[PDB]
Amino acid sequence: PLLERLKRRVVEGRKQGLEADLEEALKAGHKPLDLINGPLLAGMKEVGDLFGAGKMQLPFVLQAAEVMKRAVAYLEPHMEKEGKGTLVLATVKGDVHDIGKNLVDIILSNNGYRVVNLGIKVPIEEILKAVEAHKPHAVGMSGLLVKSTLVMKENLEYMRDRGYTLPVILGGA
Amino acid sequence: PLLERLKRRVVEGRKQGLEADLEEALKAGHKPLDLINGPLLAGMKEVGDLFGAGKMQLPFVLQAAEVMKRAVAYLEPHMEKEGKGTLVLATVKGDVHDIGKNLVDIILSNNGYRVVNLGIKVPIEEILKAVEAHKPHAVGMSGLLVKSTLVMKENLEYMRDRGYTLPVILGGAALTRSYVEELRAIYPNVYYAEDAFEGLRLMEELTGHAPPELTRPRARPVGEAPAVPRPPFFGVRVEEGLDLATIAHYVNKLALYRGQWGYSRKGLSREAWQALVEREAEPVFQRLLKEAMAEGWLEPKVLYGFFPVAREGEELLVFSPETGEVLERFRFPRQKGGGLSLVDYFRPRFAAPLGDEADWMPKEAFRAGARDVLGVQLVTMGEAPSRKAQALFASGAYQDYLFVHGFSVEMTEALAEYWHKRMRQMWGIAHQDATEIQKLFQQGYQGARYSFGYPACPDLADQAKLDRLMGFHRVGVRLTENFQLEPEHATSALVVHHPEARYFSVD
Amino acid sequence: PLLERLKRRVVEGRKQGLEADLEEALKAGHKPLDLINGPLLAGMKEVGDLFGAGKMQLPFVLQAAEVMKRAVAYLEPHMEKEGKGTLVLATVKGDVHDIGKNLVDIILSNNGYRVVNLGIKVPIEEILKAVEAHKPHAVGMSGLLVKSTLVMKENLEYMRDRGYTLPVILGGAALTRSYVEELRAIYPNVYYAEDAFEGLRLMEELTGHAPPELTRPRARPVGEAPAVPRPPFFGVRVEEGLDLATIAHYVNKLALYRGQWGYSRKGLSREAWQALVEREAEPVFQRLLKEAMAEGWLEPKVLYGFFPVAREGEELLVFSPETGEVLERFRFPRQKGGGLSLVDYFRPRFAAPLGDEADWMPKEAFRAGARDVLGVQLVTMGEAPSRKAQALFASGAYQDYLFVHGFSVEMTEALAEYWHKRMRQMWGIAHQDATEIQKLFQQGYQGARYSFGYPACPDLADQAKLDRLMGFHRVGVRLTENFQLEPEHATSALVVHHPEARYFSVD
Amino acid sequence: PLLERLKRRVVEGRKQGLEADLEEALKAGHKPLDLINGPLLAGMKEVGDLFGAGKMQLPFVLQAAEVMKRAVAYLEPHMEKEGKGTLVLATVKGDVHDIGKNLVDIILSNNGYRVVNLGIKVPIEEILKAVEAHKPHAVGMSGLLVKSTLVMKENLEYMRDRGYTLPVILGGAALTRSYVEELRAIYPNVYYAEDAFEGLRLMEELTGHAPPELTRRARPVGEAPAVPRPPFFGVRVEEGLDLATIAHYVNKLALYRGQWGYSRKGLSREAWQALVEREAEPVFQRLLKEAMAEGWLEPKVLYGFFPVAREGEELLVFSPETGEVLERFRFPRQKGGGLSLVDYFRPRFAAPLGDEADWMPKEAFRAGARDVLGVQLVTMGEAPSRKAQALFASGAYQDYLFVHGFSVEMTEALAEYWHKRMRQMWGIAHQDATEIQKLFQQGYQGARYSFGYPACPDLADQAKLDRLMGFHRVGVRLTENFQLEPEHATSALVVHHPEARYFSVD
Ligand code: B12
Ligand code: B12
Numbered sequence A: 001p002l003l004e005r006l007k008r009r010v011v012e013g014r015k016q017g018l019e020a021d022l023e024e025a026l027k028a029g030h031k032p033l034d035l036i037n038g039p040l041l042a043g044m045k046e047v048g049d050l051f052g053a054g055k056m057q058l059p060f061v062l063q064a065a066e067v068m069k070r071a072v073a074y075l076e077p078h079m080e081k082e083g084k085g086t087l088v089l090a091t092v093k094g095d096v097h098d099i100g101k102n103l104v105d106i107i108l109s110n111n112g113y114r115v116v117n118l119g120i121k122v123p124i125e126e127i128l129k130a131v132e133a134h135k136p137h138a139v140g141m142s143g144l145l146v147k148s149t150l151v152m153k154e155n156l157e158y159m160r161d162r163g164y165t166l167p168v169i170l171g172g173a
Numbered sequence B, C: 001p002l003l004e005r006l007k008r009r010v011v012e013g014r015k016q017g018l019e020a021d022l023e024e025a026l027k028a029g030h031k032p033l034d035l036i037n038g039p040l041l042a043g044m045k046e047v048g049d050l051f052g053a054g055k056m057q058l059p060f061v062l063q064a065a066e067v068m069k070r071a072v073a074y075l076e077p078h079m080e081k082e083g084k085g086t087l088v089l090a091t092v093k094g095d096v097h098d099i100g101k102n103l104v105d106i107i108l109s110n111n112g113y114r115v116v117n118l119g120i121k122v123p124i125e126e127i128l129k130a131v132e133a134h135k136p137h138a139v140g141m142s143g144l145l146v147k148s149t150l151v152m153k154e155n156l157e158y159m160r161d162r163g164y165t166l167p168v169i170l171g172g173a174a175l176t177r178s179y180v181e182e183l184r185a186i187y188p189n190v191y192y193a194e195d196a197f198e199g200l201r202l203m204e205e206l207t208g209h210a211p212p213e214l215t216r217p218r219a220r221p222v223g224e225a226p227a228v229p230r231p232p233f234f235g236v237r238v239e240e241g242l243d244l245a246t247i248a249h250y251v252n253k254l255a256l257y258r259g260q261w262g263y264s265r266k267g268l269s270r271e272a273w274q275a276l277v278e279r280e281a282e283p284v285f286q287r288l289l290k291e292a293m294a295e296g297w298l299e300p301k302v303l304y305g306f307f308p309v310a311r312e313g314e315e316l317l318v319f320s321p322e323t324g325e326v327l328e329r330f331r332f333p334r335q336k337g338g339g340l341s342l343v344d345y346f347r348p349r350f351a352a353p354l355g356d357e358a359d360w361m362p363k364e365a366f367r368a369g370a371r372d373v374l375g376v377q378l379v380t381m382g383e384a385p386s387r388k389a390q391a392l393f394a395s396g397a398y399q400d401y402l403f404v405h406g407f408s409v410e411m412t413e414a415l416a417e418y419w420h421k422r423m424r425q426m427w428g429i430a431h432q433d434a435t436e437i438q439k440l441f442q443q444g445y446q447g448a449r450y451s452f453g454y455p456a457c458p459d460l461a462d463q464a465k466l467d468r469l470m471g472f473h474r475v476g477v478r479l480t481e482n483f484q485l486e487p488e489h490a491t492s493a494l495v496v497h498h499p500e501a502r503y504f505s506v507d
Numbered sequence D: 001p002l003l004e005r006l007k008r009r010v011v012e013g014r015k016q017g018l019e020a021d022l023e024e025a026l027k028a029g030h031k032p033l034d035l036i037n038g039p040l041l042a043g044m045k046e047v048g049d050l051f052g053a054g055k056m057q058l059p060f061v062l063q064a065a066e067v068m069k070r071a072v073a074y075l076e077p078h079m080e081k082e083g084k085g086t087l088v089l090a091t092v093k094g095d096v097h098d099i100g101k102n103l104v105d106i107i108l109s110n111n112g113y114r115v116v117n118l119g120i121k122v123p124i125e126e127i128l129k130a131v132e133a134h135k136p137h138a139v140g141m142s143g144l145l146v147k148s149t150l151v152m153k154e155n156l157e158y159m160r161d162r163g164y165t166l167p168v169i170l171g172g173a174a175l176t177r178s179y180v181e182e183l184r185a186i187y188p189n190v191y192y193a194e195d196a197f198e199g200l201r202l203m204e205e206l207t208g209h210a211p212p213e214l215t216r217r218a219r220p221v222g223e224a225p226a227v228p229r230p231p232f233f234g235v236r237v238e239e240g241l242d243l244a245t246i247a248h249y250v251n252k253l254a255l256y257r258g259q260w261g262y263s264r265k266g267l268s269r270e271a272w273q274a275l276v277e278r279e280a281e282p283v284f285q286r287l288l289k290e291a292m293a294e295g296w297l298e299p300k301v302l303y304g305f306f307p308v309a310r311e312g313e314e315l316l317v318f319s320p321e322t323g324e325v326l327e328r329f330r331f332p333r334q335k336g337g338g339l340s341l342v343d344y345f346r347p348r349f350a351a352p353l354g355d356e357a358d359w360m361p362k363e364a365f366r367a368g369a370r371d372v373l374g375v376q377l378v379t380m381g382e383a384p385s386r387k388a389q390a391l392f393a394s395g396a397y398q399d400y401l402f403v404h405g406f407s408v409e410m411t412e413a414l415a416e417y418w419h420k421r422m423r424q425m426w427g428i429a430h431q432d433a434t435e436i437q438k439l440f441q442q443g444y445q446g447a448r449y450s451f452g453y454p455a456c457p458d459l460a461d462q463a464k465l466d467r468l469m470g471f472h473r474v475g476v477r478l479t480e481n482f483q484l485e486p487e488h489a490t491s492a493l494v495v496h497h498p499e500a501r502y503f504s505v506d
């Protein structure tokens, strides 16, 4: 069917002829939010399984995310929308390095979570203002250097002192 | 490397960025004929393997040939010319049909053989003058109709009488394998070719690039009809000024996509076929209608009418509406052991009238004994599509050459079908027509149309009798000496009202 | 393990190190019969599956059988035996041809059936004595020519008259499937075998090791010739002392590699075939030439000549050069509905001479009315290659048996071809010969040679008329009761000068 | 084709009909070097992949190398010749052990590298003379014992002091990965090799044919029942030993799995039993028939008993004749005052348990000796070492493997057999095992402690044992790293105490 074909276009990373197949499938009788959480997300889920096992390489994972991002862009006019949960994601104060943080943003966003990317050199005052506004499931913090981890610690001390109990996912080189 | 990329460009059919990649390969130190007989020809051989196995469809084969033809055109200034061998290729005397011949030309030329295309209506005098000049490995001859095969025979008799022993590759719609084997009597070195790729294999074997393989009643008895239906008039009138959009609704989309364009339906689902039609087949059909309407390269005409007729034994007489005298007589063939004939759908001469037909049957004809009414139509799409197609083939758009041909042909058939509907309405026998367009192709209507040449009425020289009645000049149609219609995109038919009339084979 | 290694040795055909691996397996505690009916026969059955599917070629099948035969020879002193079933196998009375029969023997024996090979020229008296002694599951009979099938019929009539009901597997070159089905009239339990592997499957079903399946308008008229060419002499002379190197240039390498040795070409490229020839086919051909020259197991002889002839109606008369009296007449068959015959290539009796042939035609013959010249050749390679092959088969070199047979056969054909060239030169009709050796096999020369038995002149009893003219003893050749040439590697031909003469089929 | 057939002959290990197939390929057109660098080396690399994945066992790997070695020998007359690179390979100064080094030689040589095998007891002066001559890609050094690793360190100190920087691949039984990483201090370009195939991968990376990867706790011991009395005091020879009787004590798993590399695990018990019957057992049966008839095992034993005592942490050994203390052994104790070997010995001047004063040597007992220690040295002579070097030289690499491991496990079997015999003599064989299989589980009274093992690990105490026993008397010699020469020889201290079993200080 066309359901298996939309899953295929994610896993292979085939953009050219996608907008034709999306326009066709609504007519087959599935809604915009339907196809997103169905074959496409399994295709993405499948690409996650493949990369986990070392059978797909990282340039094709991001080629899959390009297809998913382009699918959601085509289906956004039809929708008047509310993902699986939110991550407020920032690089720490005194750090300019944004490849790891932005890689998280790509994977989470194209797996149906909401990512509020706050950029670089973000102090904890700004991060917790975002947590109040959005009310996410977790906070993310990216560093580079070991002095960036020391800022992350001061930020956890700040967060407990204010009385946040929300999960803090830390990552960094 | 870039060697594998030039092979890839042929097999995928990618023209955009070709002339960059050719220019890069020459500076990298590769000679013109090096690339030509190297990766490019390897690409065109792979496409032949794929088409042989049914993994590439014919529109992409001709898309590959476009790339190869465009490569050779770019490398011709650098080269100072001389292929693998030569075919002198012609359509026979009294024949105008050039799609098969030109399909051979495309495949052989882009597989590195030389093709000397001599055109249409080519006599054997002209063909053998070319054989003297070029000294080819083989001579090729394309027909259409069975009278074109009888010319091919006379040509082999001519060629043996002159003392040619060179291989003669024959191909054609009407030409069969069985018949070419019986022609080995006259000229032993004669080979049949079912398609262009059979023609390529023959040319491979004949030039030594292959191992020799190819080279070595109890039925329903006649019923009286309900009534003699009354025509709008008697005699024959012209009709131009027909909407191409109305005719396009009668196109047999499978006969066009599978039959003519070679888009394979077999091997995949009906949702998989439906998706191919939406993506590939339908938008090409939609583009060529917009074009043919705006550019004016289909010119639909119709010549049509009705006549007082009768059966007298095995002959169908045709009476003049004005004089009542017998104009033509058709002796149609009957099936084995009594069996069915077309004359069996017509009332006998001086038959006691079924209804009130003496009220309206032409006075003179009815006194002469005419008791039934026969419909006749010629349709045509003009010389224009033939011209448009020769333009594309000449410029080297071989894909579009294919598409535009088949479109024109199936649009011509669609007009015969549309006008049949219209011939029923006029006659007043369109009470029982199909609700869908799809069920008109299975004869979902009263009576039927019998074109001359088909088994029921197969003598093509009866088309001269039909022109004497109708006047084919009146829509720019001409008969050749092999009784083909000129232009090629035209089809005559006898329109029968009798409800029991359906198609049958004498052979 | 070593069990898988003994299976491997059969399928790959590795005899070097076999007797070590057999000795190791028995001391490991494996009995002789355990090995025979086990790891080995599994190997030989896999090779049968592979050959059935076209993944192993016939020179490696017989290389497998060499290993199996050598294994059983090593294990026979230890054993005191007893196969799966017995075939009594013979070549028929009045036939000397033993490659097919011996190929059956090799395949069946190395697949665990017992074969009682009775040799050549075996009458049914002798065959049925063997059936009484051994009490086999089936009788086998091999022929060559169509007169050998007529003996097989008389043998089935003999066998039913005696009251044998045992299955009779018939095979042969001339024997067809259609004919063996008509023989089920006489003897219902008769089966055709296209190859040895069909013979194995029959023997499987008949011994219960298999699911029963097998067991249940146009012509060209011939014109007068340009002139009557003059022969070097009239009558027949011998020629010995022919270079085998010169003859080897006329060998049809495909007919040898594909046709005889069973090296498959099809399904691979022409560069892939060319590489196989270089590695496998060509060095074997090169070895057997060096051998046949040094060891002297081809003895090329030729008996050849020319005669004053005429057509008188449908009979080709042959006049004596010395007396002028009619020696033989040949009534040759004509194609259906008065088509072509061989007599049509010969001038009529008392025909007014084309040129100045009365200057040189034998005085007596020409007064008697002879007006044309017929050439005749017999070639032979002697009893020697038949002897050499029987040696190899007996010693168990089944691969070399295959190679040496086909070599001898295709070298015999090459001599007929070489000598035809030489027969043209002598006659003075070699102006128009081929530039390549490859185009002599396409009849690239004036006239043609018609061997008796082929469709044009198929009566094999006319070979006795040819021996009365030529004297076949003069190159050690004899006719049997079924009109076969002894030795088997010999071929007669009628050599025609007329330029319009090419090959045709009455059937 | 014949190209795929020459590859097949390597991977299956089929030498019979090889020289026919080589002669056919070259007269067909192929060049010797072309065949060397192609189908043959492709074969040997596939066998390396298989062994890497655990699908081909070590006796067939060396059967593949036999074919490759025999191919190159046949094509050497045709060639007028330069491997992929060179390893200069030696066993260290004061070491005679050459099975590991020669196993490296076989694998590397038959994978198209050049190996300059310098033999045994090779000093660094000699090794670096070879490095100057040949200019190799790497230097290899094989040891056995931990004293051989200490020489390897001094060699790296020598090599850096001279200013060599080229890679040093170290391997050895006693050598560990952890130690070679600490040696990168002295000589940074030093790599450990667990097996020959690790040695091949290093040589691949170092010659550029691979991506840089590798290259970047008590119980109390109580008093004994009694002091058992020995047949005599002092040390005697025994040479009249049946090889058939010793063969009953061979640890067939240690031989088949441990030495020959026939893997058991991942198959059934009936599948292993069938492999033993077909492959392992008839080789064991062949080499016994050979070793008996050809005489290439010469079993000797030096054995005896001594008056001893504990004096604190020292085990004194008294003279049977003079009573004076000849040797003292300070054995190590487990962490935080756990077990020592001295704890199996009665204290000096201990009040006798039974009537040992009746028979203990008068002088020794007055000097205070109160317990009896047994001692044995076994050996199979220089003969098996010679037989193995013959096979390796001839190129029978499979038989080289088999004959080595046989000799080694037959040497251990003799230590075990003679232990049984040492119990009987002593009169402590009431409680022996009914099967031979349960003697490997220590199914007997007391235990034997070989020097070098954790309990008693100072190998320089083997010189104290030679001063007592006289190793020359069975043709055995100590080297400067305290190795027994010949290599197929093993000393043990034979303890009577029933509570004595094996323990680790580390
Ligand atoms: C569509 C079609 C038409 C079109 C004609 C368009 C055209 N001429 O291409 C239309 C609808 C207009 C039509 C009309 C008629 N038709 Co019409 N037509 C067909 C149809 C259904 C398919 C034609 C087609 O497109 N073939 C594909 C082309 C490309 O194939 P091809 O030309 O044979 O070429 C291939 C091979 O033969 C080979 N080849 C050809 N020549 C050569 C030469 C060489 C050297 C080599 C190597 C290879 C080679 O190469 C090609 C493949 O690569 C056929 C059925 C059939 N063919 O079996 C009937 C058929 C040809 N028509 C027939 C007839 C009866 C008629 C009419 C006489 C109707 C009437 N007026 O009474 C007319 C004739 C046309 C005319 N102009 O006079 C008959 C002929 C009967 C006979 N001879 O006795 C056929 C055979 C139908 C039948 N089943 O009996 N028709
Ligand atoms: C090469 C050949 C020759 C060789 C003969 C040597 C030989 N026989 O091996 C040569 C070049 C010398 C030659 C000469 C002639 N030829 Co010639 N020749 C051929 C050819 C091309 C191939 C024969 C061949 O060797 N096949 C391979 C062998 C192994 O096949 P086989 O014998 O049939 O056996 C197979 C099966 O039948 C089966 N089988 C056979 N017997 C049995 C029995 C049992 C129980 C079982 C289970 C299976 C079995 O096993 C084999 C496969 O595994 C054939 C064409 C053909 N066969 O279609 C003509 C053919 C046999 N030739 C023929 C003739 C005319 C001639 C001559 C008479 C020419 C002349 N003198 O005028 C002579 C005959 C020779 C003679 N001594 O009299 C004719 C016979 C026609 C007829 N009888 O009327 C044939 C059929 C050609 C034709 N198409 O008409 N020929």
Ligand code: B12
Binding pocket: D097, D099, D100, D101, D103, D104, D139, D140, D141, D142, D143, D144, D145, D146, D147, D169, D170, D171, D172, D173, D174, D193, D194, D195, D196, D197, D198, D199, D200, D259, D408, D409, D411, D412, D449, D450, D451, D452, D453, D454, D457, D459, D482, D483, D484, D485, D486, D487, D488, D489, D490, D491, D492
């Ligand atoms: C067999 C053996 C014996 C033999 C030793 C002599 C021999 N092999 O001929 C016998 C049965 C005689 C015995 C006795 C002894 N042994 Co012991 N024995 C072993 C045993 C059980 C197995 C070793 C083996 O089979 N090696 C076979 C060869 C092929 O392996 P290898 O030398 O390791 O080589 C491999 C790799 O290291 C690599 N490699 C080696 N060198 C190099 C170099 C390079 C450049 C490369 C790339 C690779 C490389 O290649 C090989 C694989 O391909 C070990 C246990 C162990 N290893 O865990 C103890 C062991 C060697 N024994 C040891 C000792 C104590 C002794 C004795 C001193 C006992 C005594 N007398 O008191 C004697 C000494 C023998 C003598 N001649 O001096 C100790 C050493 C302790 C120490 N150094 O402090 C060990 C480690 C036992 C232990 N677990 O503690 N034993």
